[PDB]
Structure formats: C-alpha cells, structure tokens
Paper text:
Trypsin-like proteases utilize a catalytic triad for activity, composed of the highly conserved residues H57, D102 and S195. We hypothesize that three critical residues decorating access to the active site control the E*-E equilibrium of thrombin.
The structure of PPACK is similar to that of the highly specific chromogenic substrate H-D-Phe-Pro-Arg-p-nitroanilide (FPR), except for replacement of the leaving group with a CH2Cl that alkylates the active site residues S195 and H57. To rule out differences in the mechanism of interaction between FPR and PPACK, that share the same peptide sequence but a different C-terminal blocking group, we measured the binding of PPACK to the S195A mutant of thrombin. In this case, acylation of S195 is not possible and PPACK behaves as a reversible binder with a finite value of koff  = 4.6 ± 0.2 s−1 similar to that measured for the chromogenic substrate FPR. Importantly, this result holds over the short (ms) time scale of stopped flow measurements, because longer incubation (weeks) produces acylation of H57, as demonstrated by a crystal structure of the S195A mutant of meizothrombin desF1 solved in the presence of PPACK.
Residue numbers in the entry:
A (entry chain B): 16 to 36, 36A, 37 to 60, 60A, 60B, 60C, 60D, 60E, ...
B (entry chain X): 169 to 266, 277 to 318
C-alpha cells in the first residue's frame, strides 16, 4: 500500500495472507468468505511468464490479528489448503481476464473478533455501489518494496471505464474495473506488487455490511498519475464461484 | 458478410485460433474438465472443434487449445459490432433464480448469514477511522 493510513485492530477480519512454505515468503492477500473458502487472484498461484505455478502443498495461509508486533502473544492462525480452483479461462497469456482463484481450507476455521468472513454482493448491492467516484478499501502491508510492521488501509474511488480504457494499452474487459485518484484530485494511493492487498471492499449503506466487489489483479508500476489499479470484477464472476462450491 | 452477437449465432467450421493453434474437441477429456464450472448457453451447439461463443464472451468465439487453465484462444471472424463497453455497474445479470443467502451450507460451510458484520465494530456500534470517507462518497 502506498499513501495509506494506519489500520485499526480487527478492521479487516476477512483479510487472509498467503505464504509459500519453503522459504517462508509472502505471496498475496486473499479473503475469507466462509469458515473454509478463500477467494484470491489467479495470478498469485499461476503465472508462467514468471515460472510461478503454486499448488496446495507449497502454500500456507495466515488469518486473524496480524500480531501487533509488541512481541507479546502471537495468534495469527495458520491453515493448510485441501484444493485450489483457478478459473479455467484465466487469460494469463493476454490481459489476465478472470483473475480469480478459490482455495478450500483443510480444516474449517472458527470465527472470533479477529476472524470473520466478508459478503459476496447480490445484483442490487453491485448495481448500487459500482459507480464512478464511490470509494472502496484495500488493506495490505505499506511500501517504503516489501512489508512494514503496521497494516495500511487506503480508500480509492471507482473510475469511469472510458478513463480506465484511455489510461493503458492492455485490453480491459467487463471482468475488470479500475479504482484510484486522477491527477489533481489531490488525494493519491494504490495497492502494489507484493503488499498482499487482496480484496477491494465496500460498506453497504442499506444493511451496514462489508462486501468484496474487487480483487487486486494488475497495474503498471504503483500510485502513478493517470494510472489506476485494476480489480477483478467479483460480481460478474459470481456464477463460477457458486458452481465450484455447490458442486464440490 | 459481417457477424452479429459477437459470434453467438456462428455455426461455421473455423477450427484454429488467432495464434494459429488447432482447436481441441468440445467433447475431449481436457475440454469437458475445463467446462465443468462454466455457464454455457445450451442454444449454442458445441460441434466437433469449431470456435463457438457458448458463454457470451464479448471478445467472441473461442475454443480450448490444451487442458490447463488459460489454455484457450479466440478465432478471427468479421464481427459488425465491437461489443458496446458497458460501465462497471451496468448489464449486471441476475443471480437469485428465486439479507438473503446464495450458497449451500453443506459445501460452503457456515458464516454466510453473518458475513461482513465485524464483531469489533458493526456488532458494537463503533465507526472505524476512515469508514466515514466511503459513506460520504456513496451520496453522489
Ligand atoms: C499479484 C499482485 O502482486 C500484482 C497486483 C498488482 C497491483 N498493482 C497496482 N498498481 N494496483 N499482480 C501483478 O503484478 C500482475 C500479475 C502478473 C503481472 N501483473 C501486473 O500487474 C503487470 N504489471 C502488468 C500486466 C502484465 C500482464 C497482463 C496484464 C498486466
Ligand atoms: C503446474 O504443476 C504441475 C507440475 O508438478 C503440473 O501437473 C501435471 O502435469 C502433467 C503433464 O505436464 C500431468 O501428467 C500430471 O498428471 C499433472 N498433474 C496435476 C496434479 O495436474 C501442471 O500441469 C502445471 N501447470 C502448468 C500450467 O505448467
Ligand atoms: Na492514479
Ligand atoms: Zn497473444
Ligand atoms: Zn459488456
């Protein structure tokens, strides 16, 4: 996260961190949507242009209080993956279209003050909240190129497809959307390669619930003027999520 | 001449992608595997190894090319219409076919009915530092 503020405790109880076993290495952010199902970007597990092809038994997940590092009692809970599900037409050769993966936990996790799942949006919620200018939130580790001690939170407005389109030479699709600040909005901010930002979330004013509308997917550098982070359009991919889960 | 509905009506025999790759059979193991969790239009006939657009992909007709995820390619037809670029919150299809629950507790597990309400905030009527900024931006 670049140009963010200090996260509070259990501000993001859904935030799930993904680590490579050998060596202990942070890969990506993710979100908990039930006691056993974890939503993330396909590009975190699979990207052959970089020779990245991770599997169940190479990966670790950490959940809960990120250990307020006053070296006093650690409770970041550690879970293992039964199954990974990469979207079958994740267009990794072209523009990363359908940048979405599911991960089943080996053992279902118990909910606490620090571990609670995020909602997946319905038709009316998505129609209501997916507007240019409406702000969502990403939480990750701050960028000074790796991770600082305290979680950073950044609020970014959704951008008009026309400005998204005119801002990059990559073919953008209905399965993506871009968020962030235009030059001379004043406010800046972005996610970055490695901060494990994971979910882009929004708070429904109709029922006070946090919904995941996006997944950190791709960008061209970090926090640039006339550039915007791209987010997997979760809602438009919901039928896939339902079909993997309901047919498990 | 030109081809409507980004290939949704196409019945031709074009069996090679735009990278010059040969289409695999719709009916092959590696293709049936990659199709399990996708939502195809039944109207669209998955014949032989012909580039179809079963899932209404607005890029157009395609076909499996190998068996691992991402192993598909598009095919060069002469579309009249570059698909109208809908905005982020437009054209959002319906998901119900019926807070309300969407998933099946057997496979999904518990937590859906309770999702998105944080125990250290929304359960205890405590605003967080920044959530003001979000709710401010949702008015216009
Ligand atoms: C998985 C994450 O580390 C990362 C998210 C980056 C978000 N960046 C900003 N500014 N919000 N993903 C990536 O780095 C993706 C995955 C593979 C390459 N990539 C990129 O963002 C490239 N920089 C650009 C790109 C390459 C291929 C296809 C599309 C975009
Ligand atoms: C990612 O990981 C594994 C490598 O261990 C690959 O899976 C195997 O692929 C071979 C053929 O190349 C098959 O004979 C095996 O049955 C496969 N096993 C499984 C578990 O899939 C996989 O193909 C790799 N993916 C990519 C994109 O390279
Ligand atoms: Na910007
Ligand atoms: Zn290509
Ligand atoms: Zn469209």
């Amino acid at each position: 996260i670049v140009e963010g503020s200090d996260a509070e405790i259990g501000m993001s109880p859904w935030q799930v961190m993904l680590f490579r076993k050998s060596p202990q290495e942070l890969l990506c952010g993710a979100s908990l949507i039930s006691d056993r199902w974890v939503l993330t970007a396909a590009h975190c597990l699979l990207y052959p242009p970089w020779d990245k092809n991770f599997t169940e038994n190479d990966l670790l997940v950490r959940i809960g209080k990120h250990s307020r590092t006053r070296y006093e009692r650690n409770i970041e809970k550690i879970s293992m993956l039964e199954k990974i599900y990469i979207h079958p037409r994740y267009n990794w050769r072209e523009n990363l279209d359908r940048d979405i993966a599911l991960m089943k936990l080996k053992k279902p996790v118990a909910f606490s003050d620090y571990i609670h799942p995020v909602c997946l949006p319905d038709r009316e919620t998505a129609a209501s909240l997916l507007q240019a200018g409406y702000k969502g939130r990403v939480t990750g580790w701050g960028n000074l190129k790796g991770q600082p001690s305290v979680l950073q939170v950044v609020n970014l407005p959704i951008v008009e497809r026309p400005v998204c389109k005119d801002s990059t030479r990559i073919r953008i699709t209905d399965n993506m959307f871009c968020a962030g600040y235009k030059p001379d909005e004043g406010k800046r901010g972005d996610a970055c390669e490695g901060d494990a930002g994971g979910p882009f979330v929004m708070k429904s004013p109709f029922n006070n619930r946090w919904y995941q509308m996006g997944i950190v997917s791709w960008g061209e550098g970090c926090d640039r003027d006339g550039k915007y982070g791209f987010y997997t359009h979760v809602f438009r991919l919901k039928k896939w999520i339902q079909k993997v889960i309901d047919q498990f | 001449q030109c081809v409507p509905d980004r290939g949704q009506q196409y019945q031709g025999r074009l069996a090679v992608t735009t990278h010059g790759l040969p289409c695999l059979a719709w009916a092959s193991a590696q293709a049936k595997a990659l199709s399990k969790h996708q939502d195809f239009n039944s109207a669209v006939q998955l014949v032989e190894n012909f580039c179809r657009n079963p899932d209404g992909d607005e890029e157009g007709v395609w076909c499996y090319v190998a068996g691992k995820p991402g192993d598909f390619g598009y095919c060069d037809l002469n579309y009249c219409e570059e698909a109208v670029e809908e905005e982020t919150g437009d054209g959002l299809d319906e998901d119900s076919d019926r807070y309300q629950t969407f998933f099946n507790p057997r496979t999904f597990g518990s937590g859906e009915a309770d999702c998105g309400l944080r125990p250290l905030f929304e359960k205890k009527s405590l605003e967080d530092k920044t959530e003001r900024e979000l709710l401010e931006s949702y008015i216009d």
